Design a binder for this molecule. Structure first.
Ligand SMILES: Nc1nc2c(ncn2[C@@H]2O[C@H](COP(=O)(O)OP(=O)(O)NP(=O)(O)O)[C@@H](O)[C@H]2O)c(=O)[nH]1
Ligand SMILES: Fc1ccc(CN2C3=NCCCN3c3ccccc32)cc1
Ligand SMILES: [Mg+2]
Lengths: 469, 167, 167
């Protein structure tokens, strides 16, 4: 075989046993190990494993500090070369030069792969997990010093590359499409006239499109640093998960805005046009694979204030009951159909984040941080692989951009939506429900009558797009 | 006549709600877990000699999606209202969860259990007396559980099933 | 359900293996030359009516990683053989990559596509007819691509998928 360094000038050559590493029952999969062993496998000489690198860099902070990681990788990097062999001694004794065969093979087959893999971890660390360095300038300093003092011309290319990359991330993206995005659609509100913008006056096709763009950006912006360690559920969640939370608050906003558009439309006929238009918007969401959008609508219909409006449901056209009921069925049986459809469509899509959040949370609370074996405490790595499987699925859907034109005014309109105004949640939520009771009172009380509030035509332009030249 | 009950867990996040269902469904002699796999929220049990199927919904981690709460709760026949014994705020919120459940189910008598959950070793701020009294004023069972030792966890769920059966 | 396909991109340094992959993945043209060591990507996509999960391995082209190829060639099911149309050295290097894959996988019948990248440029030094001749001798399609304009990108990657499928 090949000879490893002495296990006393280099901690990363201890033989594997069930006291420092445990595998799962072509490359092997680690169930548990010590940090030394985890880092050794992370940069093994026999093979690369880019998935292990992403899994590790995403999740290591629960078992090892950043300062400690960098020190261990630096330690793993300084591999002692072996001494001249007997044949090398005999050549030198005779004025000749050694073949140094064992040494050259050790360099080419142990040191070189191990060092490049170390450099690869540093590269993924800096390029995909730069926040360790944003939140700790000393760690960034140490990293620049390490990379900067790496001598050896087999490494030169990547040393220079990683130096530039670090410099870019410190002081710091346009898109190409197969096709052209469809023409922006207009209904009653015409371009520029944002004061008239509202649920029925904008085109339902273009409401769906611009909510989908906006909700896609919010989805694409959440990093795993907001998810790992369940931080969005803790007291510092505002500090640690600001994009995840912004994204969720937008979803909530839109759901309440839907509820509010409905229950504040007191005329039955007018309210039916409202509900029907929201169902038309839902329909374009489904076309666009915006599942967050779909469920914002379905949550609104299922809310207390709206669900009870039987007189309104009764007048919804049959083909639209069908659309709403099909969407609602996505949520039944712990999201069975949604999960299958999500794993079925052609992206871009906008997933519902809530399932992911619950899975990360339970995985973390349901699995032990360590496994005790033979009196040793091994890092439970499979636990971290499960979390990373989830953050990887998330990232997979964050890549594909929608082929749709932003409309600045419509985008600003939805960004600025604020249904609750200055009111707290229970106060506003109770208001919506009372509106529901006013506009369709409990039996036996008779159904009141109410005046039109809308001066413009209630007829929907439909959800099929149009195409002038 | 295999009855399925739809139970829904509700309560403040950030305080170990999650452990209640995890310890139940786990078995619980095991200590590894995958919430991803289907029927990791299904569980056949024998309560008072009659066998039944428990379907637990626990949306822990989705608490900020506050507008989804009605959608979720509407699906359930019975409810576990959970708070942490070291978090007074989660206890004070129990009122708003109950009113919110009564509303979506459109009833003043929804089978429910109050569960006080011990999630760590930080001091108890909610004595069992106060919790007993609140639970009495609602006319519902009170059960304390430990998020570590699996104590009181079966009692919590089975009591709620008894509360459904005797509704 | 969705079939999973393990694709691998090979070729000399600077031919645009990374630019091709990132373009496919993110619709974005990477203009920086940052030599790859080994990068992994995932992409769900519908191809000929079927939902696929593409695993794409972006491999090192630099000579200094010559010794680390067998490991990744063992795992891959289909290979994108890339050369740049403005770099004749990279085209003469394609032969080596093909022979290596054939050796490592011990088959004369490994799904692959020959890809001539950088077709947006004027200064072409390898003619299509030559690359085509090579591709026919391999029994595989020749597809010209530009990671910058997106010309050919999906066609090269999806063709490879079809070949794995029909294999
Ligand atoms: N004009 C043009 N430039 C391209 C194209 N593809 C890549 N490039 C450019 O060529 C350079 C090398 O690209 P890169 O993808 O990094 O090559 P690589 O195959 O990854 N090299 P390595 O083997 O070192 O990882 C970059 O500057 C990139 O912008 C292309 O289709 N057209
Ligand atoms: F204008 C509407 C639209 C919906 C509703 C509430 N609602 C539903 N929402 C989701 C699908 C099934 N579903 C219902 C079925 C039967 C009655 C009401 C229903 C109320 C007034
Ligand atoms: Mg590359």
């Amino acid at each position: 075989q090949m000879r490893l360094p002495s296990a006393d000038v280099y901690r990363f050559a201890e033989p594997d046993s069930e006291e420092n590493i445990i595998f799962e029952e072509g490359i092997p999969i680690i169930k548990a190990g010590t940090v030394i062993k985890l880092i050794e496998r992370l940069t093994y000489h026999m093979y690369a494993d880019p998935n292990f690198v992403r899994t590790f860099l995403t999740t290591y902070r629960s078992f090892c500090k950043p300062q400690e990681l960098l020190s261990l990788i630096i330690e793993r990097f300084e591999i002692p070369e072996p001494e001249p062999t007997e044949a090398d001694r005999i050549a030198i004794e005779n004025g000749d030069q050694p073949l140094s065969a064992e040494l050259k093979r050790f360099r080419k087959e142990y040191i070189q792969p191990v060092q490049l893999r170390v450099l690869n971890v540093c590269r993924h660390w800096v390029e995909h997990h730069f926040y360790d360095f944003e939140r700790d300038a000393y760690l960034l300093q140490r990293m620049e010093e390490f990379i900067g003092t790496v001598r050896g011309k087999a490494m030169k290319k990547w040393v220079e590359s990683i130096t530039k990359i670090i410099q870019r991330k410190k002081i710091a993206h346009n898109i190409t499409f197969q096709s052209s995005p469809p023409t922006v659609e207009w209904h009653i509100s015409r371009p520029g006239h944002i004061e008239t913008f509202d649920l029925l006056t904008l085109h339902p096709i273009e409401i769906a499109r611009q909510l989908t763009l906006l909700e896609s950006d919010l989805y694409r912006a959440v990093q795993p640093s907001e998810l790992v360690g369940s931080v969005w559920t803790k007291e510092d969640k505002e500090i640690n998960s600001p994009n995840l939370l912004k994204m969720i608050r937008h979803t909530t906003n839109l759901t309440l805005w839907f509820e509010k558009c409905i229950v504040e439309t007191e005329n039955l006929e007018e309210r039916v046009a409202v509900v029907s238009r929201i169902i038309e918007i839902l329909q374009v969401f489904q076309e666009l694979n915006n599942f967050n959008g779909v469920l914002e609508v379905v949550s609104a219909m299922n809310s207390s204030p709206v669900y009870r409006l039987d007189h309104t449901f009764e007048q919804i056209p049959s083909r639209q009951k069908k659309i709403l009921e099909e969407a609602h069925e996505l949520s039944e049986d712990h999201y069975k159909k949604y999960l299958a459809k999500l794993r079925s469509i052609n992206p871009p899509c906008v997933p519902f984040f809530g399932i992911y959040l619950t899975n990360i949370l339970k995985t973390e609370e349901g699995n032990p941080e360590v496994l005790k074996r033979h009196g040793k405490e091994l890092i439970n790595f499979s636990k971290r692989r499960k979390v990373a499987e989830i953050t990887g699925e998330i990232q997979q859907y964050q890549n594909q951009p929608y082929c749709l034109r932003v409309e600045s005014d419509i985008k600003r309109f939805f960004e600025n939506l604020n249904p609750m105004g200055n009111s707290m949640e229970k106060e506003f939520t109770d208001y919506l429900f009372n509106k529901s009771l006013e506009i369709e009172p409990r039996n036996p009380k008779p159904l009141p009558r109410f005046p039109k509030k809308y001066s413009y035509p209630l007829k929907s332009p439909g959800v099929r797009p149009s195409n002038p030249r | 006549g295999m009855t399925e009950y739809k139970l829904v867990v509700v309560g403040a996040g950030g305080v170990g709600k999650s452990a209640l269902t995890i310890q139940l469904i786990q078995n619980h002699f095991v200590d590894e877990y995958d919430p991803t796999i289907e029927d990791s929220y299904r569980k056949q049990v024998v309560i008072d000699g009659e066998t039944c199927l428990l379907d637990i919904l626990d949306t822990a981690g989705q608490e900020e999606y506050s507008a989804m709460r009605d959608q979720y709760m509407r699906t359930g026949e019975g409810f576990l209202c959970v708070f942490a014994i070291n978090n007074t705020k989660s206890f004070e919120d129990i009122h708003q969860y109950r009113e919110q459940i009564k509303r979506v189910k459109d009833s003043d008598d929804v089978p429910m259990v109050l569960v006080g959950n011990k999630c760590d070793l930080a001091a108890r701020t909610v004595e069992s007396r106060q919790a007993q009294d609140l639970a009495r004023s609602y006319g519902i069972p009170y059960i304390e559980t430990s998020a570590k030792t699996r104590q009181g966890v079966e009692d919590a769920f089975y009591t709620l099933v008894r509360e459904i059966r005797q509704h």
